[PDB]
Design an enzyme around this catalytic site. Structure first.
Site, PDB file in Angstrom:
ATOM      1  N   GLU A 191       0.870  -1.168   0.000  1.00 24.51           N
ATOM      2  CA  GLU A 191       0.000   0.000   0.000  1.00 24.51           C
ATOM      3  C   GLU A 191       0.914   1.228   0.000  1.00 24.51           C
ATOM      4  OE1 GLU A 191      -3.499  -0.595   2.226  1.00 24.51           O
ATOM      5  OE2 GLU A 191      -4.484   1.178   1.293  1.00 24.51           O
ATOM      6  N   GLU A 249      -2.351  -0.599  13.167  1.00 23.81           N
ATOM      7  CA  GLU A 249      -3.534  -0.248  12.414  1.00 23.81           C
ATOM      8  C   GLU A 249      -4.832  -0.500  13.205  1.00 23.81           C
ATOM      9  OE1 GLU A 249      -3.915  -2.306   8.683  1.00 23.81           O
ATOM     10  OE2 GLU A 249      -5.164  -0.713   7.777  1.00 23.81           O
TER      11      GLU A 249
END
Ligand SMILES: [Ca+2]
Length: 1030
Positions: free
Chosen positions: A634, A893
């Site tokens: 990502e 996260e």
């Protein structure tokens, strides 16, 4: 007296290659005497340091102003390639002048495209393209029309080919719809697997097969399988290189095929296939449903040029460079500069950033060599979950070396058609996949003059689209900031070593290894371990994050990757000759070259760890763009994440240049109908117009304005903000926004309705736009009126008579209280309800990305600091303490990235290094350290430490633009002592908790009032002390 210390230009000391027309000057001041303010300043600019007494560029004269930070140059237009010397002096509030600051300088860059005469160059096709499938055919068993439809079955293929003598190289490029297993003379050389296939036919593999081919007859054999009824076929080229050119063998009707599983031996030379029919061509390459499929090559090629300079005294030399891709330049056997991953990531269609290097001491009389590695990077390599070639297919270099001589003459050497290229040792270089380096392919001496490059190839002009603008790099170039030696070596499986760096870091390693030429060492990188002590990489998804090094057999070899980076705490080492020790692997931590600006320490180890983790999560994701995660496939400039984290980021590092640069990227990506995108730079067709995400376009300029007082950031953002608000009004019904978007992402089973979120963010953006208009002296009434109308529509839709907000979530109250959306009569009720929800969860938060940054501040605002501390010191799940107890060294996260049962959350999306939940930092810095801006840029600092929880002791220093703002407080035996340091030309409001307010002893300042259990003081600059005894 008052003296100027550390003057700066555009946030830095002595910037080299600055293109601003009106560079902004700053002069922090120091004084041993308290209560100092500036009444006037005078700036001089000249072409030399000695020349400042009779300045030939500018003299502002004495200017009556208290401005001492980010004052724009306002003299005659600046010229390109010029060093400007400057000095400032100021007058205190009495009228006494300081010394002139010790002379400093900035140097302009090229200031515009017309000042470049260099040409874009690339390595030629043999070096930048993989062996291709052109000239080959997709083949299958002769059953029907395989390009249209074939059964879901396996078919078998053989070919015996007579290869030429004196083969020096052999490569196989191969792809199949759907999978294949290929062998030479009975030995398998490559395969793909049915279970792992996801349209793998799109991504041909290229395999070196020199170790399995020979002259004379060689038997190739292939099994291929079709996964379901529909198209099938496989295609290959075998390229054999000899001194007399290439020979290619294709997949075609010369191959034999069968549809019944053959006897064993079928891969061997002497197997009888005389009864097998010829294979059928399903489509020529380029035909069929498969199109113009090509293998991807990602080499970092070598480019070089020798040239002669005169035997004259050099006065100055500069190299200006950039790449569509990434580069590292070398001049006369010495690497130029200390940047990594230059030039960084921008939308290359709109702009590319260039770098300026001082190379005066590197140039020579007579023979010189300029050289560069040129790699794919973000321009041409894998980006996020989207594959390669996002901007172009081949990387390109632009370089211009300018040498000035003392006699006033000069020479310009540029990139252009006379440069030569070779493959060199960097076989593959990808940001996500890693770098592959073969030391045997080194070309010793290539960065020095006198090198024999006759068998190198002519470069080509690049066929890349030319960026609209070439601009001097705005953010700090990525550089190595520190090294982390391995702290221990384990061997959890035989010959598979795992080295722990002790910190989840971002960058790449230095490998030291001694061994035989041809030995291959593989380095895999991971954020966490499995319970058996092996590395866990499933959360990295498609990012291999593997670097491979093949030895040249030459003493204690050193390998340092150049064109990749990974996020990791652990390195797995396979193929090492012998046993690695801790010295074999050292992490090199890379990020934007900006200073850390907040020192924070308490009596509580867990909070000190939390602060460390915040600064590590920030630095790990501040590489060219503010990323969501540095480790998986990502690493995109996610607007939501930086929206929530910006205020914390602006305490802990100088984030002005970095986020200024990023906001340019965000505006470059804004859609034609005014929607900010989910990511910037915009790649891979992610969406736009999402509440709490696109709003970064408003909140991030405001956060920079609050931290730095940077008015230019607001002026440059305001038109895009207008366009965003116009977009949001068009996409709403009576000002209520749709229940679309990410919402309070990753909340703990407490999901806030997305229309409450979206309408709250719309109002908040209108509110901030009014605040911006106001700071800029513009007309704020349209925005204030818009805000008023949204707040009314909001309260009517979502706020009930008893102060309950729709969804009744922790985040529902946090956001409405934070953004001043609850009617004032109902704030108490809304806050009471928030506390009730927290108490009901056994004193745990439940907020996601959007709620978390505002939770502890809202709790404190509404008189529940004690509850904020409860959440802060909480060790059980969900909390900040929970991950810390599990050995976290960054922010995760998810609240449960490692779950309470010990397992991992889903590898479909599970990073151990997202800064979003590090947004708690700003609450600590404002409330435990007691350092917050009363006026933008800390022109006034509010010093309001609120002791609580387990904190009895704290000390902090914030490196503000005006200079250091420090605090140190201690509670002991009933008593409280606070000391602080407030810089000249700023003031402070100090709050000292006291049983009896008028009893507080204070060395400086004026008691103004008692409020909320404290004496409130107003104080000017200086070193202050406050004591409360009994
Ligand atoms: Ca198929």
């Amino acid at each position: 007296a008052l003296r100027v210390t550390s003057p700066s230009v555009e946030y830095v000391q002595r910037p080299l290659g600055l293109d601003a027309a009106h560079p902004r000057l700053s002069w922090p001041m120091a004084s041993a005497a308290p209560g100092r303010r500036q009444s006037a300043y005078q700036v001089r600019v000249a072409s030399s340091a000695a020349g400042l007494s009779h300045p030939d560029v500018w003299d502002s004269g004495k200017v009556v102003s208290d401005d001492s930070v980010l004052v724009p140059y306002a003299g005659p237009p600046l010229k390109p390639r010029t060093r400007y010397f400057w000095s400032v002096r100021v007058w205190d509030a009495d009228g006494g002048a300081s010394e002139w600051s010790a002379p400093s300088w900035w140097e302009t860059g090229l200031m515009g495209a017309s000042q470049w005469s260099a040409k874009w160059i690339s390595a030629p096709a043999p070096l930048t393209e993989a062996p291709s499938l052109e000239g080959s055919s997709w083949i299958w068993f002769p059953e029907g029309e395989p390009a249209n439809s074939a059964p879901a079955a396996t078919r078998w293929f053989r070919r015996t080919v007579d290869l030429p003598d004196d083969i020096t190289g052999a490569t196989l490029a191969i792809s199949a719809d759907n999978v294949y297993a290929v062998s030479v003379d009975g030995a398998e050389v490559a395969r793909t697997d049915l279970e792992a296939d996801n349209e793998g036919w799109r991504r041909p593999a290229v395999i070196d097969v020199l170790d399995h081919v020979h002259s004379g007859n060689n038997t190739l054999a292939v099994s291929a399988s079709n996964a379901s009824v529909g198209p099938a076929g496989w295609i290959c080229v075998l390229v054999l290189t000899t001194a007399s050119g290439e020979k290619k063998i294709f997949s075609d009707a010369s191959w034999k095929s069968t549809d019944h599983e053959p006897a064993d031996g079928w891969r061997e030379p002497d197997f009888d296939d005389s009864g097998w029919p010829a294979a059928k061509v399903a489509a020529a390459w380029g035909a069929g449903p498969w199109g113009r499929v090509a293998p991807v090559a990602s080499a970092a090629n070598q480019l070089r040029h020798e040239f002669r300079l005169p035997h004259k005294k050099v006065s100055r030399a500069r190299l200006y460079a950039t790449a569509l891709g990434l580069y590292e330049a070398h001049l006369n056997g010495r690497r130029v500069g200390r940047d990594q991953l230059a030039p960084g990531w921008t939308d290359y269609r709109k702009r590319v950033q260039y770098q300026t290097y001082d190379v005066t001491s590197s140039v020579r009389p007579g023979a010189n060599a300029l050289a560069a590695y040129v790699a794919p990077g973000w321009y041409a390599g894998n980006v996020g979950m989207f594959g390669p070639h996002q901007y172009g297919e081949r990387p390109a270099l632009l370089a211009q070396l300018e040498v000035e001589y003392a006699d006033g003459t000069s020479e310009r050497i540029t990139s252009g058609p006379d440069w030569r290229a070779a493959s060199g040792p960097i076989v593959s270089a990808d940001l996500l996949s890693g770098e592959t380096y073969d030391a045997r392919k080194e070309t010793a001496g290539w960065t020095s003059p006198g090198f024999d490059d006759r068998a190198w190839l002519a470069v080509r002009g690049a066929d890349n689209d030319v960026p609209e603008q070439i601009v001097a790099q705005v953010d700090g170039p990525v550089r190595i900031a520190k090294e982390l030696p391995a702290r221990k070596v384990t061997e959890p499986k035989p010959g598979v070593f795992v080295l722990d760096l002790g910190q989840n870091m971002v960058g790449s390693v230095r490998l030291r290894v001694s061994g035989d030429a041809g030995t291959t060492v593989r380095l895999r990188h991971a954020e966490v371990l499995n319970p058996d002590g092996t590395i866990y990489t499933a959360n990295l998804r498609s990012a291999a994050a593997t670097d491979t090094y093949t030895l040249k057999g030459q003493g204690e070899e050193t390998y340092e990757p150049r064109f990749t980076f990974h996020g990791f705490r652990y390195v797995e080492v396979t193929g090492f000759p012998g046993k690695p020790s801790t010295t074999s692997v050292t992490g090199r931590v890379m990020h934007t070259s900006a200073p850390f600006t907040f020192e924070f320490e308490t009596n509580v180890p867990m909070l000190n760890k939390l602060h460390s983790n915040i600064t590590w999560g920030q630095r790990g994701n501040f590489l060219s763009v503010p990323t969501d995660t540095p480790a998986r496939d990502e690493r995109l400039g996610w607007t939501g994440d930086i929206n929530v984290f910006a205020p914390t980021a602006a305490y802990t590092m100088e984030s002005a240049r970095f986020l200024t640069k990023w906001l340019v990227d965000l505006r470059d990506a804004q859609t034609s109908d005014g929607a900010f995108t989910d990511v910037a730079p915009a790649v891979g067709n992610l969406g736009n117009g999402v509440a709490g995400w696109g709003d970064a376009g408003v909140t991030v300029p405001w956060a920079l304005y609050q931290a730095y007082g940077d008015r230019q950031v607001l002026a440059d953002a305001l038109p895009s903000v207008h366009a965003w608000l116009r977009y949001l009004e068009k996409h709403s019904d009576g000002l209520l926004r749709p229940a679309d978007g990410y919402g309070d992402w990753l909340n703990v089973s407490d999901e806030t309705p997305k229309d409450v979120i979206a309408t709250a963010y719309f109002a908040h953006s209108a509110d901030l736009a009014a605040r911006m208009a106001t700071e800029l002296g513009k007309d704020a009434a349209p925005y204030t009126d818009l805000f008023t109308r949204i707040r009314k529509a909001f309260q009517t839709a979502y706020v009930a008579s008893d102060g309950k907000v729709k969804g009744d979530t922790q985040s529902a109250y946090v956001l409405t209280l934070s953004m001043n959306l609850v009617p004032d009569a109902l704030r108490k009720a809304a806050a009471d309800r928030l506390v009730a929800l927290i108490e009901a969860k056994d004193w745990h938060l439940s907020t996601g990305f959007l709620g978390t940054p505002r939770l502890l501040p809202v709790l404190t605002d509404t008189g529940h600091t004690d509850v904020a501390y409860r959440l802060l010191h909480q060790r059980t799940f969900p909390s900040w303490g929970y991950p810390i107890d599990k050995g976290s060294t960054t922010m995760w996260e998810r609240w449960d990235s490692i779950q309470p049962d010990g397992g991992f959350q889903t590898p479909e999306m599970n990073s151990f290094n997202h800064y979003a939940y590090g947004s708690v930092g700003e609450w600590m810095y404002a409330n435990i350290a007691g350092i917050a801006p009363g006026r933008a840029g800390y022109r006034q600092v509010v010093i309001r430490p609120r002791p609580g929880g387990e904190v009895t002791s704290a000390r902090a220093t914030f490196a503000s633009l005006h200079g250091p703002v420090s605090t140190r407080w201690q509670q002991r035996s009933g008593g409280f002592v606070l000391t602080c340091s407030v810089p000249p030309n700023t003031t402070a409001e100090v709050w000292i908790p006291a049983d009896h307010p008028d009893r507080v002893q204070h060395t400086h300042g004026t008691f103004v009032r008692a409020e909320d259990g404290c004496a409130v003081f107003e104080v000017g600059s200086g070193s202050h002390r406050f004591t409360v005894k009994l």
